[PDB]
Design a protein around this ligand. Structure first.
Ligand SMILES: [Mg+2]
Ligand SMILES: [Mg+2]
Ligand SMILES: [Zn+2]
Lengths: 120, 49, 37, 222, 93, 38
């Protein structure tokens, strides 16, 4: 019978080879995920559909920012095969009040604080 | 517009094809030599901020 | 030709009614069982 | 000149009395009155019993699941007993007598009206289980020949193996597993539910690791 | 198409997040800038909402960390104050 | 349909077929063939 699948925690334990393959630092991990739906919930179970709805990834290829906390991490682990997870990095600081209007997500995950339209 | 130029501006389309061939040769040279030094001239993308 | 007959009883719906940590009022049935469990 | 080597001596192997295969009866002495379902799982996956040598040094190894019945038992016993040497080889069974009752309905019968009467009995066999073991003061080549003869006539894939042969196969399987060069493994994907593949896979595939398909075993599957 | 665009970090679809999309299409011939385009306005609003959500989530995480640290400190101080109530006399002499 | 155990190899779901095709065993390949070097 087809049921929900529980994933062993040894899957979610990075090795130093993984820390070399990807740029993540096990000390001071990233605060926020960028999550993007890249696979339809059709031909998928209703619990995966509901989890996608809760995470707010109803629209495909639309990035959504989430916390890097265990509850939302379990939520993402449920539907990890339908989505893409990247760290949200801030080259400058967090968006301020006077720079909140002129910002851009700027794929590769770099939320740039100033967004001009001129060449460097 | 590429087909438009191919029909009505053959000189411009030949220039475009020459530029594409130059970039392709530069890509081959880059895959051979890892840049070192100039990484090509019609390479060097323009950055925006 | 189907010598076996009789075994057509419904489930008794027996088991735990209030689980661990559940607030309960006096008289509430906690678990219905046969053959003490 | 051609260099010579000492012959493998046999001074620590003793043949037992009654060295030939015991007769196997088609039906149990006490016949089963109650009819059981076809629990097809007793031929699925790897064998958990009779997987290692006990007294002999050669055997017939099953590479797939199946049911052995009295015709198969008679075939193997007759061929072994007529092709072996009583004074230097002994053969021992490793599968029980047929005990699983197979029922069949009367010919030209419509569907319904209860189960069918018990017709015969079979012995379930899983892949990786030794079926007949052989021992004595003999080398492997003659027994390998006339045991592959028998193994080719079994209902499943089978081979003639020895202690060294079987050990070599297991070590090569481990070596293939460790020196596999692609980074994508059936075990890893199935256990991590990568791509949501469990909607296509089976709950038994978590332990079968893609090496077993029904009653069929793939030894090159890694 | 462009996947090399992603390696340059440039929106694999060239129709978003770049001057080709975000610059004004036109302006008056005398020099006065044109009113903002509707798609550009909507994109700006969505970007502002995303940035505000990022700030809110980061602030909530930092506040939770501070609250946990404060709870641990308060519990440690309370237990240490519980420690010192000793007036032993039974085995003093 | 069929039972989980059958006699005819029971052709697989296409996703399972792709999984088996993608998870095949790849033997190591030396940089230079062992016979060529001395
Ligand atoms: Mg019943
Ligand atoms: Mg009923
Ligand atoms: Zn050579």
């Amino acid at each position: 019978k087809f049921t929900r699948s529980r994933i062993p925690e040894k899957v979610f334990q990075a090795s130093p080879e993984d820390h070399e393959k990807y740029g993540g630092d096990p000390q001071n991990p990233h605060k926020l995920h960028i999550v993007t739906r890249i696979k339809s919930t059709r031909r998928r179970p209703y619990w995966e559909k509901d989890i996608i709805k809760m995470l707010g990834l109803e629209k495909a290829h639309t990035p959504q920012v989430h916390k890097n906390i265990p509850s939302v991490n379990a939520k993402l682990k449920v539907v990890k095969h339908l989505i893409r997870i990247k760290p949200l990095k801030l080259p400058q600081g967090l968006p301020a009040e006077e720079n909140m209007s002129n910002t851009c997500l700027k794929s590769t995950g770099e939320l740039v604080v100033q967004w001009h339209l001129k060449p460097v | 517009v590429l087909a438009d130029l191919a029909i009505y501006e053959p000189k411009t389309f030949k220039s475009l094809a020459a530029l594409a061939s130059r970039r392709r040769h530069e890509g081959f040279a880059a895959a051979l030599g890892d840049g070192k030094e100039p990484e090509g001239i019609f390479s060097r993308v323009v950055q925006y901020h | 030709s189907s010598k076996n007959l009789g075994g057509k009883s419904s489930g008794r719906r027996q088991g735990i009614k209030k689980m661990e940590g559940h607030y309960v009022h006096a008289g509430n049935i906690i678990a219905t069982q046969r053959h003490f469990r | 000149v051609k260099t010579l080597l000492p012959v493998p001596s046999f001074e620590d192997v003793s043949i037992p009395e009654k060295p030939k295969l015991r007769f196997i009866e088609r039906a149990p002495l006490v016949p089963k009155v109650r009819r059981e379902p076809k629990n097809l799982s007793d031929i699925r996956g790897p064998s958990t019993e009779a997987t290692e040598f006990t007294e002999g040094n050669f055997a017939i190894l099953a590479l797939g699941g199946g049911y052995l019945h009295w015709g198969h038992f008679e075939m193997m016993r007759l061929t072994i007993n007529r092709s072996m040497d009583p004074k230097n080889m002994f053969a021992i069974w490793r599968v029980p007598a047929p005990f699983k009752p197979i029922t069949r309905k009367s010919v030209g019968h419509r569907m319904g009206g209860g189960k069918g009467a018990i017709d015969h009995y079979v012995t379930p066999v899983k892949a990786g289980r030794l079926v007949v073991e052989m021992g004595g003061r003999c080398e492997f080549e003659e027994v390998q020949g006339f045991l592959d003869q028998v193994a080719h006539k079994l209902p499943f894939a089978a081979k003639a193996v020895s202690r060294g042969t079987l050990e070599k196969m297991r070590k090569d399987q481990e070596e293939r597993e460790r020196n596999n060069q692609n980074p994508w493994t059936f075990e890893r994907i199935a256990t991590a539910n990568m791509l949501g593949i469990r909607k296509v896979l089976s709950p038994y595939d978590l332990t079968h690791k893609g090496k077993y398909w029904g009653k069929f075993y793939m030894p090159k599957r890694v | 198409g462009g996947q090399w665009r992603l390696q340059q970090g440039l929106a694999a679809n060239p129709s978003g997040y770049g001057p080709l999309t975000e610059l004004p299409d036109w302006s008056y011939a005398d020099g006065r800038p044109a009113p903002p385009m509707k798609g550009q306005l909507r994109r700006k609003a969505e970007r502002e909402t995303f940035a505000r959500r990022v700030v809110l989530l980061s602030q909530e995480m930092d506040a939770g960390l501070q609250a946990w640290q404060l709870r641990q400190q308060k519990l440690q101080e309370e237990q240490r104050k519980q420690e010192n109530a000793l007036k032993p006399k039974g085995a003093s002499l | 349909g069929s039972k989980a155990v059958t006699r005819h190899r029971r052709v697989m779901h296409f996703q399972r077929q792709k999984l088996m095709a993608v998870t095949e065993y790849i033997p190591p390949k030396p940089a230079i063939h062992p016979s060529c070097l001395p």
